[PDB]
Amino acid sequence: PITGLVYDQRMMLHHNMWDSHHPELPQRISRIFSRHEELRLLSRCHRIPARLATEEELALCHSSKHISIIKSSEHMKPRDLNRLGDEYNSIFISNESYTCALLAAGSCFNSAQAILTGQVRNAVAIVRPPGHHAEKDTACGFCFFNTAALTARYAQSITRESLRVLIVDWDVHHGNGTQHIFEEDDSVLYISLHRYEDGAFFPNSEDANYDKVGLGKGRGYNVNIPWNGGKMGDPEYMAAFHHLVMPIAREFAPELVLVSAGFDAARGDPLGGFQVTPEGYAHLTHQLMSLAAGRVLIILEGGYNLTSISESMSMCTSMLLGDSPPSLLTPLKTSATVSINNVLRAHAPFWSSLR
Numbered sequence: 001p002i003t004g005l006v007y008d009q010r011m012m013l014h015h016n017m018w019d020s021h022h023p024e025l026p027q028r029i030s031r032i033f034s035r036h037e038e039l040r041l042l043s044r045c046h047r048i049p050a051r052l053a054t055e056e057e058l059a060l061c062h063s064s065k066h067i068s069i070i071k072s073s074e075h076m077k078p079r080d081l082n083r084l085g086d087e088y089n090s091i092f093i094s095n096e097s098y099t100c101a102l103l104a105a106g107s108c109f110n111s112a113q114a115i116l117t118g119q120v121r122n123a124v125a126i127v128r129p130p131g132h133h134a135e136k137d138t139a140c141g142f143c144f145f146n147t148a149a150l151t152a153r154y155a156q157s158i159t160r161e162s163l164r165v166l167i168v169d170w171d172v173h174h175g176n177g178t179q180h181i182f183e184e185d186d187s188v189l190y191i192s193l194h195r196y197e198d199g200a201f202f203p204n205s206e207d208a209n210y211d212k213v214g215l216g217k218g219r220g221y222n223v224n225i226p227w228n229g230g231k232m233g234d235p236e237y238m239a240a241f242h243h244l245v246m247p248i249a250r251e252f253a254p255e256l257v258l259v260s261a262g263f264d265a266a267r268g269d270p271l272g273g274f275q276v277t278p279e280g281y282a283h284l285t286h287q288l289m290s291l292a293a294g295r296v297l298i299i300l301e302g303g304y305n306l307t308s309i310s311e312s313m314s315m316c317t318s319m320l321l322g323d324s325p326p327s328l329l330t331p332l333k334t335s336a337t338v339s340i341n342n343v344l345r346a347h348a349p350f351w352s353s354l355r
C-alpha cells in the first residue's frame with residue numbers, strides 16, 4: 001500500500017553530559033524529521049507509533065546480563081554512568097539512554113509489523129541511539145542494543161522462525177554485532193559495505209574482511225564488502241550493488257529487507273570520509289525496493305553531518321514513496337575493483353549468480 005514513518009522526539013533525550021558536541025547528537029533525528037516535513041514527505045507517510053521494546057524482545061539477541069547492566073544505568077549518578085560507559089568501546093550513557101534504546105528497537109518492531117501485516121508496503125525509522133555495533137553481550141560504538149538484528153528476530157517471531165530476512169548495512173562502519181549475531185544463521189543474510197583499511201578503520205577488526213563468509217549452515221550468508229585506500233562514492237557503491245548485493249540478494253529471495261541505514265558514507269561526513277550523494281542513496285534504496293515484494297524497512301544507524309543525513313535519508317523515503325530516481329558516475333578507483341573482485345572470489349562458491 002503506502003510508506004510508514006516512525007519518529008519520536010523522546011529519543012533525543014539520550015545525550016553526552018560530558019561532551020555536548022559528541023557527533024552522535026540528539027538533533028540528528030530531529031533534523032532528519034524536520035527535513036521530511038519541509039520536503040512534504042512526512043504528510044505523504046503513514047505515521048507509525050513508537051513504543052518501548054520489552055525485555056523479552058531484547059533477549060531475542062541479547063544476554064540477560066547485558067540487558068540488566070544497561071537497564072541499571074537508568075538510576076546511576078554521573079560518576080557511575082561515566083564508569084559504566086568507559087567499560088565499552090566508544091559509549092556514553094545518560095539516565096535516558098536505556099529508554100531511548102528501547103524506543104529505537106520498539107519503533108522498528110512496530111514498523112516491521114506494519115509491513116508484515118500489510119498495513120504499509122515499506123517504512124522508515126528515524127531513530128537513535130544506533131545499534132549495529134551492539135553485540136549479544138555488550139555495548140559498542142554508540143550502540144546499546146542491535147536494533148536491526150532484533151527486528152529481524154522480531155519479524156521471525158510473528159511469521160516463522162526461518163523467515164528469510166536480508167540485512168543490508170550501508171553505514172560506513174562494519175556491523176560487527178549484526179555479523180556475529182547471525183554468523184551461523186542461514187535465515188538472515190547479512191550484507192555490509194564498510195570502510196576497512198586493513199583494520200585501521202573503526203571497529204578495527206579483521207572480522208570486517210571479505211573472507212569472513214559465515215559459519216556452519218550460515219556459511220555463505222555473510223557478505224563483507226571492505227573498502228581500502230581512501231574516499232569512495234556513488235560509482236563504487238553502484239558497482240558493489242550491481243556486481244554483488246543485488247545478484248546475491250535476488251538469489252537469496254528475501255521475504256523482508258532491513259537496511260542498516262547509516263549515512264556516514266555521505267559526502268560531508270566527518271567520520272566517514274566518503275562522498276556518496278543523496279541521489280546515490282536514492283538509487284541504492286530504489287534497487288532494494290525490487291526485493292521482497294517491496295517490503296523494505298530503512299533503519300537509521302550512523303551518519304553525523306546533520307545536513308547530509310537529513311538530505312540523504314529524505315531521498316530514501318522519497319524512493320520508498322515511489323518517486324522517480326534522481327539522475328546520476330565515473331570509472332572506479334582501482335582498489336574498489338580489487339575489493340569487489342575479492343568478495344566475488346570469496347562468495348562465488350556459495351552463490352551461482354556470481355559464477
Ligand SMILES: O=C(/C=C/C#Cc1cccc(NS(=O)(=O)c2ccccc2)c1)NO
Pocket residue numbers: 022023090130132133141142171172173174202262264271301302303
Ligand atoms: O558511526 C559509527 C561509529 C562511528 C565512530 C567512531 C569512533 C571511535 C573511536 C574514536 C573516534 N574518534 S572521533 O573523532 O570520532 C570522536 C568520537 C566521539 C567523541 C569525540 C571524538 C571515533 N558506527 O556505525
Ligand SMILES: [K+]
Pocket residue numbers: 169170171172173174175192193194
Ligand atoms: K556497513
Ligand SMILES: [K+]
Pocket residue numbers: 182183184185186187188189190214218221222
Ligand atoms: K548470516
Ligand SMILES: [Zn+2]
Pocket residue numbers: 171172173262264301302303
Ligand atoms: Zn557508522
